[PDB]
């Protein structure tokens, strides 16, 4: 049995500013929120305790009013290096997040989550250097 | 006379949830706002944020906008977030004017620009 931490929610009025699409930084709000949710449930509760060092975000598909989406969390690497996917109801990959944190027994919860997470092909968004072609 | 598009702001408690420091996503909110403000007086495809020095309650910071590159239809921005002394606190490079580019001061791009996320 392979496992995937998941958070589903819907695009609300708060998340939209102009021309009926989810505002760019609100994606980041969501990604952060879901990342805390993963650490809150993996040994580092606010009552138990991490600093965000770095993050990359790609926006691939527009998100409209009422649109329900899912954020799925993968461990790409650790010593920790995360990769989160934001997918539509169709399964359409709508956004990506790549994110690095560090500290200021969780090593077990994250180890067994990594050991028990499914194998996917990492999309081209992972470690894609930003440039104009 | 070379110019720079700039927004100065103070860290409020609205920007703090835990660890007595500015929440990571609020940086993105600030950056996106400053970009929008630039395009108003002149979609986001892609973006990269680095957090190099934590922001505390009462810190007066400045966000400064540079154009790293531009094309017929794309803008490649690089934005710096610095404390009141000059300390580089955070960076934001973003893929989404000609005369802003021509009249902006030539700087040495910090190593954050085009950096690839990895554990060393
Ligand atoms: C805009 C959108 C419909 C793309 O449709 P499109 O106009 O047909 O463009 P396509 O990507 O299909 O076509 C490929 C072109 O886009 C360019 N492009 C796509 N992604 C790029 C990136 N990260 N950097 C640079 N160029 C990019 C390709 O290089 C190519 O350019 P070319 O014309 O020089 O060959 C889609 O990307 C989108 O809706 N994204 C969501 C944006 C968003 O919601 N952001 C958050 C809130 S603003
Ligand atoms: C502790 C703090 C000062 C980090 O800087 P520092 O302690 O001076 O750390 P150093 O530069 O000496 O490097 C520490 C290690 O981090 C590693 N590291 C630093 N940045 C990294 C990155 N972006 N990706 C991967 N690894 C990184 C370095 O390789 C270094 O390796 P080592 O421990 O093997 O020596 C931290 O308080 C900070 O940077 N604050 C900003 C974070 C913040 O406010 N976040 C936003 C909200 S969560």
Method used for this model? X-ray
Q: Would the CB of A37 count as within 6 Å of ligand 1? A: no
Nearest atom, ligand 2, residue A102 CA: 16
Q: Any idea of the CA torsion for A73, A77, A80, A82, to the nearest 10 degrees?
A: -30
Cβ–Cβ under 8 Å, residues B99 and B112? no
How far is the C-alpha of B77 from the C-alpha of B80, rounded, in Å? 10
What ranges do the domains of chain A cover?
1-117
B29/A contact by beta carbon, under 8 A: yes
B49/A contact by beta carbon, under 8 A: yes
How far is the C-alpha of B106 from the C-alpha of B41, rounded, in Å? 22
Residue B45 CA, ligand 1 centroid: distance in Å: 6
B50/A contact by beta carbon, under 8 A: yes
Tokens of A70: 């899912």
Cα dist. A95→A13, A27, A63, B34, B85 in Å?
19, 8, 10, 22, 36
Query: A79: nearest CA in chain B?
Result: B119
In chain A, residues 67-96 whose CB comes closer than 8 Å to chain B: 77-81
**Resolution number, Å:** 2.5
Q: Tell me if B23 and A46 make a contact (CB, 8 A cut-off).
A: no
Domain at A1-117, CATH class: alpha beta
Residues in chain B closer than 8 A to A79 (CB atoms) = 119
Residue partners of B98: CB distance under 8 A and separation at least 6: B70
Judged by its nearest atom, the ligand closest to the C-alpha of residue B95 is 1
Q: Tell me if B49 and A62 make a contact (CB, 8 A cut-off).
A: no
Cα dist. A88→A23, A67, A76, B53 in Å?
16, 8, 22, 35
Q: Tell me if A59 and B43 make a contact (CB, 8 A cut-off).
A: yes
Residue partners of B12: CB distance under 8 A and separation at least 6: none
Domain formed by B1-104, architecture? Roll (3.10)
Cβ–Cβ under 8 Å, residues B82 and B92? no
Cβ–Cβ under 8 Å, residues B95 and B46? yes
Query: B48: nearest CA in chain A?
Result: A56
**DSSP notation for A45-99:** -TTT--EEEEEEEEE-S---TT-EEEEEEEEEE---EEEEEEE-SS--EEEEEEE
Residue with tokens 């420091």: B21
Q: How many CB pairs under 8 A join A and B?
A: 97
- Maximum separation of any 2 CA atoms in chain A, in Å: 47
Residue with tokens 């509760």: A45
Mutate to test the interface with B, among A26, A35, A44, A56 (most CBs of B within 10 A): A56
Residue with tokens 């092909």: A121
């Amino acid at each position: 049995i392979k496992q995937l931490f998941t958070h589903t929610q819907t695009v609300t009025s708060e998340f939209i500013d102009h021309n009926n699409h989810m505002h760019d930084a609100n994606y980041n709000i969501i990604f952060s929120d879901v990342v805390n949710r993963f650490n809150y449930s993996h040994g580092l509760s606010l009552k138990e305790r991490l600093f965000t060092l770095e993050e990359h975000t790609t926006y691939l598909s527009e998100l409209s009013l009422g649109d329900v989406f899912t954020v799925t969390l993968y461990i790409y690497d650790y010593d920790l290096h995360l990769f989160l996917t934001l997918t539509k109801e169709d399964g359409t990959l709508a956004s990506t997040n790549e994110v690095m944190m560090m500290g200021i027994s969780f090593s077990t919860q994250i180890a067994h989550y990594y050991k028990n997470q499914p194998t996917i092909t990492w999309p081209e968004q992972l470690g894609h250097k930003i440039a104009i072609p």
